[PDB]
Write a protein that binds this ligand. Sequence first.
Ligand SMILES: Nc1ncnc2c1ncn2[C@@H]1O[C@H](COP(=O)(O)OP(=O)(O)NP(=O)(O)O)[C@@H](O)[C@H]1O
Ligand SMILES: [Mg+2]
Ligand SMILES: [Mg+2]
Ligand code: NA
Length: 438
Amino acid sequence: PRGSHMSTAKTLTLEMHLGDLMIGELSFDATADTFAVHYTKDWQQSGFPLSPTIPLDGTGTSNQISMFLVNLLPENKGLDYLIESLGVSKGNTFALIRAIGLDTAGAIAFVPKGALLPETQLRPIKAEEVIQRIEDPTMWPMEIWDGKPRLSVAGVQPKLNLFYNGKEFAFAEGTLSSTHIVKFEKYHHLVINEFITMRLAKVLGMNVANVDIVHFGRYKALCVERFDRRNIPGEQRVLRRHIVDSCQALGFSVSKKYERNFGTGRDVKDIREGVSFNRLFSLAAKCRNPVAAKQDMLQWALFNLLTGNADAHGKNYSFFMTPSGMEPTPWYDLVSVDMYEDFEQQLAMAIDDEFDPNSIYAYQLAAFMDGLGLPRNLLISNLTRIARRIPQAIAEVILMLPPLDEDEASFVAHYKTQLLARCERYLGFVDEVRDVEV
Ligand SMILES: Nc1ncnc2c1ncn2[C@@H]1O[C@H](COP(=O)(O)OP(=O)(O)NP(=O)(O)O)[C@@H](O)[C@H]1O
Ligand SMILES: [Mg+2]
Ligand SMILES: [Mg+2]
Ligand code: NA
């Protein structure tokens, strides 16, 4: 270079790339301990911001940038392995983003200024390599391969984000990126649970991510196709689409993923500063089609009630970012959490101030809709329709299952029993909703 040769001229700036296009810079001021994000003039006129709170005019606050970036980070053991591998402090978000920057959720690659990219290639994986990690997580952490941490998506469950074309898995490197998220079970029948729940949404005609069960030896894992990615058929190139989760969209910390953001503790049960339904629905205004977005959110809420998904928190709903506004993404992380009866559950987001799923009746649903300023008939029609279609849908989904052992078949039987019971419960009072005096 003809200018400054100080290391910091390169190391304090991560360029922001969308494919082969540089759209701006994420800079970190050492002295102030702050982040900043500025975009190119072409991108300001033509593109979209990283999130609604990191605007194209470049005035995004350090704190909003920081929380946005933290929301991109792993939430499981993968985070600790990453920190350890780099030798950095926990709060050094900049270094962590540098580390995972070539493949984060969404479409933006964070690339060190004036540095040579790692070689663009694949690192193929053998089933046996996954198996030793399933069987001995202590000797063989799932997240470390060839001595390097690999996880660059969020969520608490063990997983890998991988490249995949229907036969073999690999790590993407350089300009290539992962296309799938493979989720491993640490609880019984969790893969089957999520497979059924996700396929049920699909059969019902919902907008939902594609999932397969895959096998590593005897072990099942859930392979989820990423909707922030499209592998171009006929060549080695993965296009990206930018997304943000609802925390990011609201400018909230990862700590606010649950509405009760300080937890289940009864001393904090009325501290409800996290993502709530009212807050989630407020984001519809930023969407290309606000009414359609609210309908999707409502269908999501109802589907989650009917399937017993008590973990539908703010990081489990996302939006595409586009030049014309946000668009809700296909659904993901749909699980019948209700099936785990060694755990007493609360809804992630309350309905009419009610967090106990078992205490949702017609009153709560009517109050919910009134408080969202939506007509009750929209809930009545959708709830009735989904609940009535579920008996056929679940029959269809069960045909999609691979060979089951006895314990697995019994799980599926119980899943179905409980599912049909929730449907019948809600159908039992849905026609009251109209007449409720809230
Ligand atoms: N199909 C998908 N396409 C794109 N991004 C996805 C997809 N599925 C998941 N993600 C992203 O990956 C993250 C983790 O996936 P998720 O299925 O939610 O795992 P999880 O471990 O079960 N999360 P949680 O239980 O809520 O702590 C999500 O928060 C999204 O940011
Ligand atoms: Mg999740
Ligand atoms: Mg989950
Ligand atoms: Na919950």
